[PDB]
Paper text:
If the size of the binding pocket is a key determinant in PC binding, the mutation of Gln79 to a smaller residue, like alanine, would allow PC binding. To investigate this point further, we evaluated the Gln79Ala (Q79A) mutant of ATP11C. Consistent with the equivalent mutant of ATP11A, ATP11C Q79A retained PS-dependent ATPase activity, but not for PC, indicating that PC cannot be occluded in the binding pocket of this mutant. To help reveal the molecular framework for this, we solved the cryo-EM structure of ATP11C Q79A mutant at 3.44 Å resolution. Due to the smaller side chain of Q79A, the binding pocket becomes larger in the direction toward TM1. However, because the Ser91 hydroxyl group remains facing toward the phospholipid binding site, similar to that in WT structure, the shape of the pocket is not widened (i.e., unchanged) towards TM2 or TM4. When we superimposed the occluded PC in Q79E mutant against the Q79A structure, the binding pocket in Q79A mutant is not wide enough to accommodate PC, due to unaltered rotamer conformation of Ser91 compared to that of WT. These observations suggest that the hydroxyl group of Ser91 is inherently oriented toward the phospholipid binding site, and an additional hydrogen bond contribution from Q79E side chain may stabilize it in the opposite direction, which is a key requisite for the widened binding pocket found in the Q79E mutant.
Numbering used by the authors:
A (entry chain A): 19 to 29, 38 to 416, 651 to 726, 743 to 1091
B (entry chain C): 27 to 350
Write the structure that this text describes.
């Protein structure tokens, strides 16, 4: 209930046509983005680790822990800032437009964003309306106008509106004669088809004639005017309150299942690290209880270590152990997954299959964070006019058949009427001849409580009693409005649940006469049930943007309507038939690569660290690193970083030629199988077994009193180098065995990693620089390789460690 | 118009290997048959090495060194008799072992200055921060800084063979060539100032636990300071609480007689190193070597176990897949 005067002349508290779709400003951006980023557990942890390493102690260097975190923060900040500046630029176009206002008996021109409620406005032919107008008159008689809403329902049929009978005659002839009227309206709502109101037009002396206002008088925002020279309307809703601006809902954020699994694995490994550190510090302070086990006359504390507070000492030792064993959670993974996501997205643009000579353009990638998300789609929501039909498109029926063969459920959400919407569904092979149409339109609900009886009849006594293809639901937007909004009157049997079960147990669902927001409501309703089904939405019109921004991954067709949905989506293909190739092969490959990379990155560091934790039982729990600082720094940077990146950027697990020709293979990764508890436990136990085998095999080897033909003993750096060599060879050969698509790049990287490791060991060991405070590794590697016993032991260990994998490979080839 | 490059279109030629049970089955047999003979050879080699260890720490009233456990101003001497059953023919290496001695502790490993032992003049007069509290003594920097150098094993061991009569005959032991050639000739050098060794260490002092300064260890100038073989050998860490270090070398006699004929021997030792303070043990090991090194059956046992577990599994899988 709001009152507005036509000319603001009396016979307020409203906004001012200002559309903002952005979230960050031009100053608060940094504090808000940093707060949003550092709230995550991984980003907090890395920081905490960097600060503790800087403050208390570090084994190798603070730079190797401070630089990659900064790079990771910077890349994401740049991405978010650019994607928000794009929305700022887009809003700048919608605002700062030209409109013509008759303020005081003259055709004043103002800026579009300065509209205030209650002023008569004039728009010429083919001009988009600036706000919610109410028709006062027209250039011609009969008070009619032809308006097409290409941005509200998706079609381009010529609708008709009727002017006010008492006001048709006012055409540029004293229309601002202090026209006494009061437009009493209803509060704005997203119904888009309901409107109650009344006019209080007065006469020269006095009048009280009041004509009711309905949907035939509202002139909606974002609908172009056609076949009319000029009209005159009165703004009632202006900005963030128009029926067009209410159905936006914004974009919150999109995360992948692989990304969530990474966080879960990080949370598990955090507990593993805490348990390791606590056990080590407890055993250390139990072992130091003996008077002669600390300061045994051959190494004594510099008085400080004695004068330090005992209570602070356990906390310092705990921080030192956490820093020493912090390597089990690699920052390299994050830095790498960033490069992989950035570089691998180029293949979609480069692909020659996504090319249409008519549009003379190719595919387009707006974000690179859903490449793995393309390979986990479960539900597909399609738009009828523009996407499915152009008659049908080139391969609309066969693409739907292929999608059905892959185990996906295809729903058609449109804004067209049922009469023309149902025939299109009957032509896309979505509705066969022998299927019973389960119909819930407005043609059968002319009341309120008939729906509850109908739902009970068609769910409880019709269908679940049992034929899985026969029943296909057909619904209307009007019925869905009551189903959604009026479901909070009874609680014994929830309307949403009893309607969701019949939707989900049906073969296909068609929904006609739907507002832009109701599509996002349906998509959101689907997303919450029984876990987390993964949804994909495809559209080409501006009314599809609400459901594109709500689904897990949004695809936007580059069509004749415009690029409104092409820039707001994640990917863009200039056809509908391209979807089969886009998500059958590319998504499968991306998901396989990223899952294998994550699993290998965790396993490679767990097996790296376990021997070092086992070593503490043979020293005095003094936090003595087993390896050299150079090896600790260089392990994840050059020795093992390149083979996994080369594997995860180009590796055909299954050749794309048979991936595209066999849609059935999409079901092998349907439920995130590659990152499940089974594989996680298998990789963790493999790493734990190999880590134990390394350390104990070398410990039993180091009880000889000599390993050379000249009778000379070895130090601890030789022990560490033996363990490190066995480690590097085992972790490289594991991936070499797992590789299935060997290119020249894979050969080069995999063999060059080992060759470079050997050459770097020989080069670092043998030259005194000198710029270091110590020369512990002067000749360790070259002296280590002069013994047949060590050669044979290493050769035996690189086979003992891989025996589980070799046995599993064989067992996976029978029964 | 798009570039039809194999790299851009994901069409790079590849090998695409497909390993199967019917093609990897002979590997399980060949590995076992190449591994078993190696294991047998290695385990047989490990059994033809003779070795004896003599524990001479004391801590027992029936031991001759119980009088050596706690002297005051008396330089203690022991003598332990022992017998050899089978003579030693190969080369003989003298070792000394310590137990419950943590050479790999963090506070003890890093307590050294590797640059000063390299002959650096700047580091000669001022030692590094890490080697504390053995950085300065009596307002004079110690030449070898750190506990790793300060606590060196300093016992004197001499072997005596008892002939047919009661007159013992000594055995010649050589101190040269027991340390790594590379870290003896490159990593450990002497200060370059002057020819006489005593005047090179002017602003330095001997360690606290020392008895004579570091430039008087041996008469030969080649093994006098920072090059002494025992010093260099002790400077190398141990990696385990129980370890052994090379002490002397016994060389072959010119004639074909065995190097150590069987019989009774005498071990006169000079008990200077206290080890009972932290429940440690001292021992001396006389051992021969071979192409592989010391006596340890672990390698042969592991090779035999791996070969057997591979061959049996291969046979089992061969008899199982025969159903098709
Ligand atoms: C807007 C979108 C853009 C998104 C990306 C586009 C392009 C980006 C390019 C950026 C290039 C690299 C980014 C720099 C950030 C890394 C900086 C850096 O040095 O990190 C150092 C890290 C070290 O971590 P860690 O060892 O795992 O352990 C960390 C633990 N917390 C600790 O305590 O310490 O180590 C690492 O994070 C490893 C570095 C990355 C791994 C890949 C490097 C491979 C190169 C190999 C080098 C030589 C190869 C020689 C081998 C020969 C083989 C043929
Ligand atoms: C031998 O070294 C020990 C350990 O420091 C020391 O106590 C003893 O006095 C030394 N014997 C000498 C220098 O004769
Ligand atoms: C070593 O001890 C034995 C045992 O009595 C003795 O005969 C011999 O003279 C001693 N040698 C030295 C150099 O003290
Ligand atoms: F063209 Al529509 F909903 F009818 F996108
Ligand atoms: Mg449209």
């Amino acid at each position: 209930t709001r009152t507005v005067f036509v000319g603001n002349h009396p016979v307020q508290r409203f906004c001012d046509n200002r559309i903002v779709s952005s979230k960050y400003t031009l100053w608060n951006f940094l504090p808000k983005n940093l707060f949003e980023q550092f709230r995550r557990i991984a980003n907090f942890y890395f920081l905490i680790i960097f600060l503790v390493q800087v403050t208390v102690d570090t084994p190798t260097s603070p730079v190797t822990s401070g630089l990659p975190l900064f790079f990771v923060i910077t890349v994401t900040a740049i991405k978010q800032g650019y994607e928000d500046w794009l929305r700022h630029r887009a809003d700048n176009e919608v605002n700062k437009s030209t409109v013509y206002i008759i303020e005081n008996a003259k055709r004043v021109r103002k800026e579009s964003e300065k509209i205030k409620v209650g002023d008569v406005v004039e728009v010429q032919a083919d001009e988009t309306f600036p706000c919610d107008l109410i028709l006062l008159s027209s250039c011609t008689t009969d008070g009619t106008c032809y308006v097409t809403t290409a941005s509200l329902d998706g079609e381009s049929n010529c609708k008709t509106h009727y002017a006010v009978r008492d006001t048709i005659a006012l055409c540029t002839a004293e229309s601002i004669d202090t026209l006494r009227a009061a437009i009493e309206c209803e509060q704005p709502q997203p119904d888009l088809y309901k409107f109650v109101g009344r006019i209080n037009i007065y006469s020269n002396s006095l009048e009280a004639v009041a004509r009711s206002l309905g949907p035939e008088n509202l002139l909606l925002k974002g609908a172009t005017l056609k076949n009319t020279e000029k009209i005159y309307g009165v703004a009632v809703y202006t900005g963030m309150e128009t029926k067009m601006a209410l159905n936006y809902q914004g974009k919150s954020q999109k995360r992948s299942a692989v990304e969530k699994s990474i966080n879960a694995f990080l949370i598990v490994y955090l507990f593993i690290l805490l348990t390791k550190a606590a056990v080590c510090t407890t055993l250390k302070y139990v072992w130091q209880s003996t008077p002669y086990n600390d300061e045994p006359w051959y190494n004594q504390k510099t008085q400080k270590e004695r004068e330090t507070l005992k209570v602070l000492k356990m906390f310092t030792d705990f921080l030192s152990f956490m820093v020493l064993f912090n390597f089990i959670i690699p920052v390299s993974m994050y830095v790498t997954v960033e490069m992989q996501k950035f570089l691998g997205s180029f293949f979609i643009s480069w692909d020659k299959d996504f090319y249409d000579e008519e549009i003379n353009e190719g595919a387009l990638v707006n974000t690179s964070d859903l490449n793995e998300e393309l390979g986990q789609v479960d539900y597909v929501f399609t738009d009828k006019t523009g996407t499915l039909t152009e008659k049908l498109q080139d391969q609309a029926a066969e693409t739907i058949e292929a999608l059905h063969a892959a185990g996906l459920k295809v729903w058609v959400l449109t804004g067209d009427k049922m009469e023309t919407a149902k025939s299109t569904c009957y032509a896309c092979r979505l509705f066969q001849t022998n299927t019973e149409l389960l119909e819930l339109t407005t043609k059968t609900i002319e009341e309120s409580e008939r729906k509850e009886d109908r739902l009970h009849e068609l769910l409880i006594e019709y269908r679940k009693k049992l034929e899985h293809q026969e029943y296909g639901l057909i619904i209307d937007g009007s019925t869905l409005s009551l189903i959604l909004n009026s479901s909070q009157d009874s609680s014994s049997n929830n309307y949403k649940s009893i309607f969701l079960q019949i939707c989900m147990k049906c073969t296909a669902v068609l929904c006609c006469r739907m507002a832009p927001l109701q599509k996002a409501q349906i998509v959101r309703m689907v997303k919450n049930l029984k876990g987390s089904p993964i949804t994909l939405s495809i559209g080409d019109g501006a009314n599809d943007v609400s459901m594109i921004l709500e689904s897990h991954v949004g695809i936007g067709i580059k069509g004749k309507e415009g690029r409104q949905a092409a820039r707001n989506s994640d990917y863009s293909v200039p056809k509908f038939k391209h979807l089969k190739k886009l998500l059958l092969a590319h998504g499968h490959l991306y998901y396989v690569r990223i899952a294998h990379l994550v699993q290998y990155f965790f396993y490679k560091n767990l097996c790296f660290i376990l021997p070092q934790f086992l070593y503490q039982f043979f020293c005095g729990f003094s936090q003595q690193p087993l390896y050299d600082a150079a090896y600790l720094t260089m392990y994840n940077i050059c020795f093992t970083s390149l083979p996994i990146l080369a594997y995860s950027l180009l590796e055909q697990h299954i050749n794309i030629d048979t991936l595209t020709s066999d849609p059935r293979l999409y079901m092998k990764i349907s439920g995130n199988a590659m990152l499940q508890l089974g594989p996680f436990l298998y990789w963790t136990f493999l790493a734990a077994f190999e880590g134990t085998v390394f350390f104990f095999g070398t410990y039993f080897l180091f009880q000889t009193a000599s390993l050379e033909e000249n009778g000379k003993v070895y130090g601890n750096w030789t022990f560490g180098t033996i363990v490190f060599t066995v480690l590097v060879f085992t972790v490289t050969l594991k991936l070499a065995l797992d590789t299935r698509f060997w290119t020249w790049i894979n050969h080069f990287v995999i063999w060059g990693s080992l060759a470079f490791y050997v050459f770097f060991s020989f080069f670092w060991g043998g030259i005194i620089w000198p710029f270091l405070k110590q020369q512990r590794m002067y000749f360790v590697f070259a002296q280590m390789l002069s013994s047949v016993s060590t050669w044979l032991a290493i050769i035996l260990l690189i086979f003992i460690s891989l025996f589980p994998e070799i046995l599993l490979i064989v067992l996976k080839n029978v029964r | 118009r798009p570039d039809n490059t194999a790299f851009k279109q994901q069409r790079l030629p590849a090998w695409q290997p497909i390993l199967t049970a019917g093609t990897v089955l002979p590997i399980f047999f060949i590995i076992g048959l190449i591994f078993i003979p190696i294991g047998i050879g290695i385990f047989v080699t490990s059994n033809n090495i003779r070795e004896i260890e003599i524990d001479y720490t004391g801590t027992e009233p029936s031991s001759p060194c119980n009088k050596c456990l706690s002297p005051d101003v008396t330089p203690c001497f022991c003598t332990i008799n022992f017998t050899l059953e089978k003579s030693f023919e190969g080369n003989v290496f003298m070792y000394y072992g310590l137990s419950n001695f943590y050479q790999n502790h963090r506070r003890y490993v890093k307590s050294r200055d590797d640059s000063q032992l390299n002959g650096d003049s700047s580091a000669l007069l001022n030692p590094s921060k890490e080697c504390e509290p053995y950085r300065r003594n009596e307002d004079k920097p110690i030449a070898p800084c750190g506990a790793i150098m300060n606590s060196m094993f300093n016992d004197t061991l001499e072997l005596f063979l008892i002939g047919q009569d009661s007159y013992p005959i000594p055995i010649a032991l050589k101190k040269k060539g027991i340390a790594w050639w590379t870290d003896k000739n490159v990593k450990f050098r002497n200060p370059p100032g002057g020819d006489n060794l005593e005047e090179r260490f002017k602003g330095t002092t001997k360690p606290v636990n020392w008895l004579k300064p570091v430039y008087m260890l041996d008469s030969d100038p080649d093994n006098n300071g920072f090059i002494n073989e025992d010093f260099i050998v002790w400077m190398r860490t141990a990696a385990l609480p129980t370890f052994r270090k090379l002490y002397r070398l016994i060389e072959r006699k010119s004639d074909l007689h065995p190097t150590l004929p069987a019989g009774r021997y005498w071990l006169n030792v000079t008990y200077n190193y206290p080890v009972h303070y932290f429940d440690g043990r001292k021992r001396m090991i006389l051992s021969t070597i071979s192409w592989m090194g010391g006596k340890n059956p672990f390698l042969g046992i592991a090779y035999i176990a791996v070969g057997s577990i591979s061959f049996l599994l291969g046979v089992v899988l061969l008899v199982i897949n025969h159903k098709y």
